[model samples]
Target: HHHMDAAKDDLEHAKHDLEHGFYNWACFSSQQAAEKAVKAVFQRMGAQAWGYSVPDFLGELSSRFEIPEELMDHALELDKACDALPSGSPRNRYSRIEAERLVNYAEKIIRFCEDLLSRI
Candidate 1:
C-alpha cells in the first residue's frame, strides 16, 4: 500500500520499532516522521517545502507563526533530538531510552502539524 500519511505511517512504525527494541531504525524513522510532519506545514500553507533537516524546516515555520509558548519551549529540543539520529546504518546503535525519546518528539511534531492543519 502506498504510504498515506507520515503521522499515521512513519510515526506508527517508529513507535512499533521502538517498542520492539529496534532502536536504530526507531531513531531513523522517528526523525523521518518528524521531518514529514514539519513539511506538511509548509505544504498546507500552499508553499512548496523542501529539505529534510528538521532545524531548517522549523526555522521557516517559526517565521510563519508565532509558535505557541509551550511548543516553542520544547520544539527546538525535540528537533535537536531528532536530528541527532542519523539514518541508515547498521553500525549506528541507539539506546532504547533515546529511541523512545525520539519517537515521542516525532509524535509531538506530528500532532503539532495536525492541530495546525485542522484549524485551516
Candidate 2:
C-alpha cells in the first residue's frame, strides 16, 4: 500500500507540474509514476520489484493480456526515449520531447495495469 501511495503522489505531482507548464518535471514525475505503479503491482503479487526491469515488466504485461509483443515494445521504446534525455536540463527541446514521450508511456502503462486489474 505504501508503494501505491507513492505512485499516486508521483502521478499527482506530474499533473500539477503539467498544469503549471513544468513539462520536464512533469516528465520525470511521470517516470516515477510508472515505476511506482509497476513496483506496487509486484509488491501486491509478493514478488521482488528488482526482479522486474522495464523490459521484463512489459513482457509480463504482454503475456498477461495475450497481446502482440509490439505494443509493449512500443511502450518500452517510449520509456527509453524518455530515459535518454539529459538529467537536469529541463528546458531543452529534446527534454520536452522526452517528457511528452514519458507521459505517453505512462498513460499506456496505466491502461495496461487497469486492464490487468480488471481481469484478476
Candidate 3:
C-alpha cells in the first residue's frame, strides 16, 4: 500500500492493540499512522516528504496551506507518543489512557489529511 493506505492500516492496528491492552504498541502504531497520513498530504502535493516528526511535516505543509493550530497540537502529541526515545522501553512507558489519547490524536491527524487530500 501507499502512504495513505499504510496510515489507515496503522490506525486500525493501533485501535486493535489498544483493545488488547497492548498500550505500547498502540501508541507506537498511532504515531506511525499520523506520520504516514501527514506524508500522504505531501505526496499528493508531488513533493517527497521525510522524517517521523509529524509536527515538522505539518510545519512544512503550513507554507502552502492554512494548517490549524489544533492540528499542529495533535501532531505534537503523536510525535511524542512514538514510544521511541532516549530512555525507557516502550513496553513499560505507555498506559492505556495515554495510548487511547494517542490513538485519538492520530485519528484526528489522519482525518485532517484525508479531508485535505480530497480537496487537492
Candidate 4:
C-alpha cells in the first residue's frame, strides 16, 4: 500500500481536472499527488508509512531524512487546500484562484519529491 506506484499519474489527473474547470477536484488531485509521491518515497525505502495528515507526513519524512525547505514549504502550502472541517463541515472550501494556487504547490511538491526519491 505504501508503494503508491501511480503517484506521478495523480499529477496528470490534477492537470486534466484543471483543464476541465473542476477546480476543487484539481486541487484535491494535486494534494493527492503530493501525498502519494511522499508515500512512495517511504515505501521505496522500506520505511514506515505515514498518516494522512499532510503536515505530519512531511514532518515524519523530515525525521527519516533531510527534506529541503522549499519542498517542505510547498507541502505545507498544499495542505491549505484540503482544510476540510471535521470531515464534513462545508465551510471555506476554496475559490478558483485559491484552488489553483494549491495545485501549483502540489505540482512543485510532486516534482521535488520525485527528484528527492531518485537521489536515494
Candidate 5:
C-alpha cells in the first residue's frame, strides 16, 4: 500500500534526521511515520480515515481490533511532539533523547500496523 510505503519512508527519514542531529525534524517525521502506518491499516480495512492524529486513528481502530494501551500511550506522546512545529523553533525545542524516544515509539506503532495488516 502507498501509505505503508510512505510510512516506511518517513521512518527512514526520521532515523536519518536523528543521525544528522536534526532532532526536531526527527520527531516530526516519527509522528508522520506512525500516522501513515495507522492510515495503512485503515486503508486495508476499507475505513474512512481522517486527521493526522495517531491516537485518534487508534481510537477508531479499536472498534475492529483490540487496541493496546501501550500503543495508545505511544500515539499520545507522538501527538504531543507536534507542539514543536507550531513554535517555529523546532530545532530548539527537541533533543536527541526526545527524538529517539519518538522514533522508537513510531517504530512500535508501525510494527503494530504491519502485523495488523497481515491479519486483516
Candidate 6:
C-alpha cells in the first residue's frame, strides 16, 4: 500500500507541475512516476523491487515485447531531449513538446510493464 501511495503521489505531482508550467520539474517528476510505477508493480507481485536505469528499463521492454528497436531508440532520444533542458527554464515551445513526449514514453513503459506482468 505504501508503494501504491508513493506511485500515485509521484504521478499526481508530475501532473500538477505540468499544469503549473513547470516543464523541467514535470519531466523529472514523470521519470519518477515511471520508476515508482514499475516498483509498485513488482511489489504487487511480491518481488523485491529492483531499480533500473532508463536505458535498461527500455531495453527489457523492447526485448520482452518484441517491440521494434526503433521505438526504444525514439524514446531514448526524447529522454535525452528532456535531460537537456535547463533546470528552472521557462516552459518554451520545444520544452512543452518534449514534456509531452516524455509523458508519452512513460505511459508506453508503464503499459509494457503491465503487459509483462500479465504474461508472467
Write model 4 residue lDDT over 1-120, tens digit each, in one string. Answer: 344557668778988887786877887888888888778777778888758856667888887688788777777777774444443234333455666777777777767677777788
lDDT for each residue of candidate 6 in 2-118, tens digit (9 for 90 to 100): 644565576678778777878788788767766665665556566554335555545544433475565466446545534465555443767777776776666665566566566
- Candidate 2 vs 5: which has more TM-score: 5
Cα lDDT tens digits, model 3, 23-70, are: 889989998998899899888889977566888899989889899999
Global lDDT scores for all candidate models: 0.70, 0.64, 0.86, 0.73, 0.90, 0.62
**Which number leads on lDDT?**
5
TM-score of each: 0.74, 0.63, 0.85, 0.76, 0.88, 0.62
Q: Predictions ranked by lDDT, top down?
A: 5, 3, 4, 1, 2, 6
TM-score computed on alpha carbons, candidate 1: 0.74
Question: TM-score winner among the candidates?
Answer: 5
TM-score of model number 2 = 0.63
Worst 10 residues of 2 by lDDT: 59-68
Error of 1 at 55 (Å): 1.0
Model 5, stretches more than 4 Å misplaced?
Answer: 82-94
Worst 10 residues of 4 by lDDT: 85-94
TM-score of 5: 0.88
lDDT (Cα) of model 6:
0.62
Clashing pairs in 6: none
Predicted candidate 2 versus true structure: per-residue lDDT over 7-107, tens digit per residue: 67887788787767687688777777777666666666676545334566655544334644654664565455335656565446665675666676666
Candidate 1: deviation at residue 28, Å? 0.3
What number of backbone clashes does candidate 2 have, counting pairs of residues 3 or more apart or in separate chains? 0
* Off by more than 4 A, model 2: 51-53, 60-74, 81-101
Q: Which ten residues in a row have the lowest lDDT in candidate 1?
A: 74-83
Error of 1 at 81 (Å): 9.0
